[PDB]
Amino acid sequence: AVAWLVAHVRMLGLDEREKSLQMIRQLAGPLFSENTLQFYNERVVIMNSILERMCADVLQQTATQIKFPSTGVDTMPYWNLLPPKRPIKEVLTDIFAKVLEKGWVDSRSIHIFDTLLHMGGVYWFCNNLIKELLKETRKEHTLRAVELLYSIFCLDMQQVTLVLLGHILPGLLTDSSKWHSLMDPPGTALAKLAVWCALSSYSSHKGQASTRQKKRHREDIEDYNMRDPLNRVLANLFLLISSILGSRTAGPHTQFVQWFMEECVDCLEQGGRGSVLQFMPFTTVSELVKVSPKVVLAITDLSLPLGRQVAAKAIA
Amino acid sequence: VADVVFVIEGTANLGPYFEGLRKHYLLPAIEYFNGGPPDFGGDYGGTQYSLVVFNTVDCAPESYVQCHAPTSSAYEFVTWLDGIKFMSCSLIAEGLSTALQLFDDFKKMREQQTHRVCLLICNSPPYLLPAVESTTYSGCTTENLVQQIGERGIHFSIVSPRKLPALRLLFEKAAPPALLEPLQPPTDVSQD
C-alpha cells in the first residue's frame, strides 16, 4: 500500500484514490471485528502504525492529516526542519553563529547539517564555512571555530576534505584577491584544519554513514607510487605548495605555508611520501629548507642517496 | 473623471521635433490633469491611463515592447516622455491595434457605460501590410482605422503638425469625421 501510494505520488496526483486507501488503512477498520486469531494485534497495530508513519511523509504532508493511528508519546523529532519560504543563507546565522558561542556540536542541528550537506554541494558548503570562519579576528574564537568545524566536518572526512582542500587552497593561492583573507590567524587555523583532515584521511578510515554509502558514486581526475584519488590530491596540493613557495611576491602565503609545514609535524605520520622516480618533492623540500628540521627530517624517508642531497642542503 | 490616453509614434521619424511637440501640446495639457510636476497620490481612481510609444518594424528583429505604465500617477508619464531614445514606413498599425485591444480590455474590466475618450497623434507617415498578428484582428492600416472609427464611435481627433503629408486625404475613409477642424494659430486649447 505504501509503495503504491508512493507510485501514485509519482503520478499526476489528481485522483488521490490511494490517499483514501491509505486513510482507510489508518482508520479503525480492523478493530477486532473479525475473528483475528492473533492475540497480539495490539502491539502489531502499533508496529503497523509506526511503519506507516515513518514512510509516506510526502503524502502525510501534501495531503490531509491522518487520524492519529500512532497513539504514542512523541514521534520522530529528526525531520526536515528547513523553513520553506527562506533562502539557504541561514546555515551560518542559525547554526554556525550559535555553536560558536556554544560548547558542543548542537546534536539537534547535526541532522539538519547532514541534510544540507547531502542536499547541496561541498564546494559552496566549505566556502561559506571558511567565510563565516573569517569573521572573529581574534585567536581564541577562531581556534574554537576551527576545532568545532573539524568535528562537524566528520561523517564525510575523506572525499569532502579532499575536494575542500583542492578547491580552497588553489582558490586562494591562485590570485592576490584571496590573499587578503589568509593574512589573518584564521589562515593559520585553516592550515591546521587542512593538515588535520589530510592526516586523518591518509590513515585508515572506514567512513560508513547513512548519507555517504548511498552517495559515493562520482568521477574526478583533478587534472594533476600508484594512481589513487587521495594520493593524487595529496601530490597536487604538495605541488601547489611548492609553487606558492616561489619568489617575486610574498606577503601572506609564505607565512601560511610555513604554518602548514610546522603543523605538519606529527608522530606516526606518513604524508609527503615523495616517490623517487620522477617526482617534485625532492626539489620542493630543497626550496622549503631554502626558505627548521621538520622538513629536513620528513624528506629523510630512508636515508636514500636522494635524501642525502637534501640532508647536505639542510646542513648548510 | 477625464480618462484620456496619449499615444505617439513619431519618435523614430522626428526626435528633436518631438521635444518641441511635447513642450507645445502635451506638457501644457499635462498641467490640465495635474496640480504641478513635483510626489503625488496615485491609485485606482478611474482616471488612470496608459502610455504607448514604440518604433517601426524595420529595425526591430527581436524587440517591440518595453512598456510599463499602469497608472504613472500622472507624473512618471511626463517623466519618461523626455527620457526616451529614438530609432519611410512607420508600422504604426501594430501600436494602434495593441492600443485598441488595451482600450477594449479596459472597457471590459474598468467599467464604472464609461464614456471612453482618447486622442492619437503620429507625425510619421504610416503604411504596412500586417495589422495585428497577435489577436483576432487582421487587415491593414486602412482596415484598422475604419474598424476603430466605424464599428465603434470612439471619440478621436487628430491635430497634426503644420506640415501635411500625403496621408490626410486617404485618412478620410472613415465615416466618422477625423475632425481636423481645430486648426487655429492661437495656442493649444484646454478643451474645445
Binding site: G171 | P61, E62, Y127
Partner: protein, 732 residues
C-alpha cells in the same frame, strides 16, 4: 583543421582543477566563450573578425552560468545572481554596463537561464516549399500565449535555485521596483536539475533531482500572472517518471549530468549514462487510457510516459537538442537540420546524428561545447584543455544533391530573411558560381511573389545580396550595392524632411513628379514646380559641407568613369544602368540646386570655376538618363562629348567596405592576435582624433559624432546599422 586559434603566454592552468563551461546565443554574435585564464571574468567575441577578442569584468565568483534571450545584449550572472539582465545600447555591443535590475538570491548558485518571450515560427517547408505561398503559409506562426502578459507581454528572469532546494521568488521585471513575493514549491525537494521553460501551454515546468541513482522528478506546473505586484506560483504535481535504463541487471551506474531539454516539452528526455558509461535515452508523453478490465464480466484519461530510443554508446558531452522545424511531417527527402540533434564524441571527431536514427552522419575523418546554429559548424571547446574553437564540414549527409542542396539553401536563406535573424551559411553554401544563379533566382522570386511586403523587405534583401556576394571577383557589384543602398536611404530620408507650407498636394508628392520634365534648362522646371516652400530653418547649413559632397563626388565619379569601357573590366568600376536610380539622383541634384538658390553655400565642384558647372552636369546626367532609361545604349556621340573632362575632376572617395574570412575549400587558420593578411565627414582620416567607432557596412564614423544639429543622421543610426552586426569599436 582550419579556423583554430591558440594562446602563447597562457597554459593549462595547473593550479585550478577544472570548471564547467556553457554559452549560446540564438541571435547574432552567438559566441560567449566562458573560460578561465592563467573567478576570471567573462568574454565576448563575434563570428567575424575573431582576432579582436573582448572581455569584461564580472561581479561574482566562478561565473557559473550565463545565457541571453534575444538580440538585445544581455546575460544572467548566476552564482548568487548579482548583476542580472540589462541593455547596452550605448555605442556598440562591447560594453556590459550591468544595471541595478538584479535579484539578490542570497547564498545561491543557480544554473538556469530561460523565460524567453514566445514560440518560434512554424515552417511547412516539405509541403509548401515556398512555391507560390508568398511566405504566407510557407512561414507562419501559430498563436501562443505570451509568458507573463499584462495586452502587453512582460518578461522576467525566473530560474531555479540549483544550489538551493526550494524555489525562486521576488521577480522585478523591467520596472526597477521591488515587487517581493514568496513561493513554497511542494514544501520539499532537492534539485541538481536543468530547466525547461517553454511547454505547450503558456506555462513553465521543471523536474530533476540527482540523476539515475534515484528516480525523483518534481514537475512543477507554475503560473505567475495573478495580480499586480504579487505572485502565486503553483506546485501542480505532473506525472513523474525516469529512465528505464537502470532495469539492466548488468549494471545501474548511469548518473546523468546534463539532462537538457527543448522548447517542445513532449518529445525528448536527455537522461544518459554519464559514469567514467555512455547510454543516450529518449522518452515521450504519449497519453493513453488504462485497460480497465479483468475486474468483472466486461476520467479514464491518464498520462504514462513511453520509451522512444536508447542504446549503448561512447560519449560524454552533449551540445544541444534542436530553432528547429515542426513535427508530424514526413520529411524524408529533407536533409536540412530539421529537428537536427548533435552530440560530441570524446575521442576527437564529432558524430552528430539526429534522434531516432543514431546511425551516423558526415564526420570527415582526418570542458563543454554547444551547437552554434542550424548551419553545421560547431565550436572546438572539447575536453582537451584551454583550446580555441574549430570548424566542421556542414555537409548534410553522405550523398550529393546539387539541385536539392541549392533548394534547401534558398529555403533557409528566405527563412532567415523573413525572420530577420543573423546568417552564417557561408561554410554551407557551394562555390559562388551557383550563387549568381541563386541570387538572381532569389531576387526574381522575391520581386514576383512578394506580394507587397517588398516595400518593407527591400533593405533586408539588399543586405542579403551584399553579404552573399561579398565572399567569392564580384566585389564590383558588392560596392555597387553598398553605394546604391546608402544613397537610396539618404534620399528616402531627405524627401519627406521638408518643413514646407501646405499646398494643393503634398510637398513630397509634388516633388516626386519632377521625373516628368524636360531634359535641359533646369532653371525653368525648378520654378515651374515650386521654389518658395523649401526652407526648413536657418540652421540647416551643415549638410552641404558634410554630407552633400557625397552625392556630388558620386555623380562626378559616375560621369568621368562612363566613357572608359576600354578598361580591362566590362562594367569597369560600376555601370548603374537601372535608370530609376539616375532619376532619383537627378531629383537630388535639382533639390540641392534649389537649396543653393536658397543659400549660396551649397556643395560645389571644389576644384575650379566654382563662382555654373552644375548646369552642364545636370544636362549630361539627364542626357545619359534619357539615353539609358528604356533599354538604351551604354559605354556614340554622347560618349565622345562626355569624353571632355573640364578642370573639375575630384577623387579620393570612400567606397566603404570591410575584410572577410576567405576560407575557400581547404584551410585558413587564424590566431587570437596579430591577424594574418589575406558618414561623409571623412570616415577615413590620416590620424585618429576621436573614439573611432568602427562599422561593418560602410560607415566607419565617429561615436559621439562631434556635432551640434546633425542629430537626424545620428538618431536614424543610433541602433544597429545596415546589417550592422560588425558595428564594433576599436582604440588607437
Amino acid at each position: 583543421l582550419a579556423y583554430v586559434c591558440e594562446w602563447e603566454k597562457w597554459s593549462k592552468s595547473t593550479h585550478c582543477p577544472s570548471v564547467p563551461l556553457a554559452c549560446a546565443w540564438s541571435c547574432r554574435n552567438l559566441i560567449a566563450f566562458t573560460m578561465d585564464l592563467r573567478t576570471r571574468m567573462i568574454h565576448i567575441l563575434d563570428t567575424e573578425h575573431p582576432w579582436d577578442l573582448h572581455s569584461i569584468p564580472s561581479e561574482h565568483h566562478e561565473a557559473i552560468t550565463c545565457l541571453e534571450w534575444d538580440q538585445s545584449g544581455s546575460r544572467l550572472l548566476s552564482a548568487d545572481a548579482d548583476g542580472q539582465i540589462k541593455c547596452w545600447s550605448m555605442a556598440d555591443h562591447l560594453a556590459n554596463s550591468w544595471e541595478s535590475s538584479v535579484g539578490s538570491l542570497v547564498e545561491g548558485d543557480p544554473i538556469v537561464a530561460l523565460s524567453w518571450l514566445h514560440n518560434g515560427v512554424k515552417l511547412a517547408l516539405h509541403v509548401e516549399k515556398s512555391g507560390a505561398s508568398s511566405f504566407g503559409e510557407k512561414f507562419s506562426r501559430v498563436k501562443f500565449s505570451p509568458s507573463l502578459t499584462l495586452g502587453k507581454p512582460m518578461e522576467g528572469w525566473i530560474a531555479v535555485t540549483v544550489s538551493g532546494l526550494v524555489t525562486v521568488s521576488l521577480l522585478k521585471p523591467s520596472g526597477q521596483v521591488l515587487t517581493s513575493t514568496e513561493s513554497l514549491c511542494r514544501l520539499r525537494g532537492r534539485v541538481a536539475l536543468a530547466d525547461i521553460a517553454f511547454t505547450g501551454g503558456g506555462n513553465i515546468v521543471v523536474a530533476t533531482a540527482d540523476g539515475s541513482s534515484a528516480s525523483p522528478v518534481q514537475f512543477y506546473k507554475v503560473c505567475v500572472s495573478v495580480v499586480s505586484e504579487k505572485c502565486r506560483i503553483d506546485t501542480e504535481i505532473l506525472p513523474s517518471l525516469f529512465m528505464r535504463c537502470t532495469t539492466d541487471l548488468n549494471r545501474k551506474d548511469k548518473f546523468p549530468a546534463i539532462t537538457h531539454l527543448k522548447f517542445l516539452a513532449r518529445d525528448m528526455s536527455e537522461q544518459v549514462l554519464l559514469c567514467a558509461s555512455s547510454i543516450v535515452e529518449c522518452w515521450s508523453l504519449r497519453k493513453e487510457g488504462l485497460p480497465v478490465n479483468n475486474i468483472f464480466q466486461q476520467q479514464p484519461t491518464i498520462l504514462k510516459w513511453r520509451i522512444l530510443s536508447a542504446t549503448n554508446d561512447l560519449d560524454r558531452v552533449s551540445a544541444v537538442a534542436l530553432t528547429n522545424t515542426d513535427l508530424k511531417v514526413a520529411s524524408d527527402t529533407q536533409f536540412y537540420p530539421g529537428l537536427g540533434l548533435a552530440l560530441a564524441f570524446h575521442d576527437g571527431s564529432v558524430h552528430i546524428v539526429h534522434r531516432l536514427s543514431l546511425q551516423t552522419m558526415a564526420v570527415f575523418y582526418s570542458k563543454a561545447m554547444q551547437l552554434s546554429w542550424t548551419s553545421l559548424a560547431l565550436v572546438g571547446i572539447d575536453s582537451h584543455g584551454k583550446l580555441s574553437v574549430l570548424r566542421l564540414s556542414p555537409s548534410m549527409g553522405h550523398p550529393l544533391e546539387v539541385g536539392l542542396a541549392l533548394r534547401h539553401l534558398l529555403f533557409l536563406l528566405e527563412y532567415c530573411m523573413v525572420t530577420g535573424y543573423d546568417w552564417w551559411d557561408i561554410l554551407l553554401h557551394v562555390q559562388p558560381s551557383m550563387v549568381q544563379s541563386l541570387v538572381e533566382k532569389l531576387h526574381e522570386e522575391y520581386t514576383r511573389q512578394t506580394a507587397a511586403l517588398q516595400q518593407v523587405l527591400s533593405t533586408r534583401i539588399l543586405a542579403m545580396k551584399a553579404s552573399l556576394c561579398k565572399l567569392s571577383r564580384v566585389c564590383d557589384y558588392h560596392t555597387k550595392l553598398f553605394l546604391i543602398a546608402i544613397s537610396s536611404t539618404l534620399k528616402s530620408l531627405l524627401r519627406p524632411h521638408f518643413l514646407n507650407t501646405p499646398d494643393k498636394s503634398p510637398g513630397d508628392r509634388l516633388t516626386e513628379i519632377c521625373t516628368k520634365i524636360t531634359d535641359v534648362d533646369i532653371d525653368k522646371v525648378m520654378i515651374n514646380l515650386k521654389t518658395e516652400e523649401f526652407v526648413l530653418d536657418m540652421n540647416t547649413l551643415q549638410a552641404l559641407q558634410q554630407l552633400l559632397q557625397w552625392v556630388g563626388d558620386f555623380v562626378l565619379y559616375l560621369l568621368a568613369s562612363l566613357p572608359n569601357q576600354g578598361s580591362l573590366l566590362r562594367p569597369g568600376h560600376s555601370f548603374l544602368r537601372d535608370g530609376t536610380s539616375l532619376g532619383m539622383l537627378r531629383e537630388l541634384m535639382v533639390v540641392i540646386r534649389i537649396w543653393g538658390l536658397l543659400k549660396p553655400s551649397c556643395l560645389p565642384v571644389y576644384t575650379a570655376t566654382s563662382d555654373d558647372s552644375m548646369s552642364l552636369l545636370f544636362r549630361l546626367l539627364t542626357k545619359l538618363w534619357i539615353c539609358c532609361r528604356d533599354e538604351g545604349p551604354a559605354s556614340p556621340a554622347s560618349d565622345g562629348l562626355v569624353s571632355r573632362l573640364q578642370p573639375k575632376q575630384p577623387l579620393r572617395l570612400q567606397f566603404g567596405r570591410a575584410p572577410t574570412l576567405p576560407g575557400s575549400a581547404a584551410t585558413l587558420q587564424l590566431d587570437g592576435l596579430a591577424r594574418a593578411p589575406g558618414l561623409h565627414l571623412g570616415a577615413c582620416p590620416t590620424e585618429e582624433c576621436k573614439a573611432c567607432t568602427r562599422c561593418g557596412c560602410v560607415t566607419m564614423l565617429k561615436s559621439p559624432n562631434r556635432t551640434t544639429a546633425v542629430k537626424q543622421w545620428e538618431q536614424r543610426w543610433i541602433k544597429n546599422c545596415l546589417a550592422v552586426e560588425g558595428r564594433g569599436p576599436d582604440a588607437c
